[PDB]
């Protein structure tokens, strides 16, 4: 094996199905998802 499917999952669209209030509750948890997205971005560019 050399490569895997380069996938990226969005913070809000995955966690909350386009609810602004649900987004606000998610933003209370802080930088979880943006670090999650950054780690998966690191994987994506890493694979290339």
């Amino acid at each position: 094996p050399v490569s895997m499917t380069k996938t990226s999952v969005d913070c809000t669209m995955y966690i909350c199905g386009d609810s602004t209030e649900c987004s606000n509750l998610l933003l209370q948890y802080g930088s979880f998802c943006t670090q999650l997205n950054r780690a998966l971005t690191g994987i994506a560019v890493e694979q290339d």
Binding site: C11, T12, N37, T41
Partner: protein, 48 residues
Amino acid sequence: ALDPLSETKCTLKSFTVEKGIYQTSNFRVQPTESIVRFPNITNLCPFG
């Protein structure tokens, strides 16, 4: 939100932005109209 450079500067949390490609925000198409549906039925009330 001034220009694509400025979204990069804010997401990076740095005024200087070095060489590369940066994900800042997520594009989205906002729902424009709305539709609500329910099946037509022949069960008219015989009250008349």
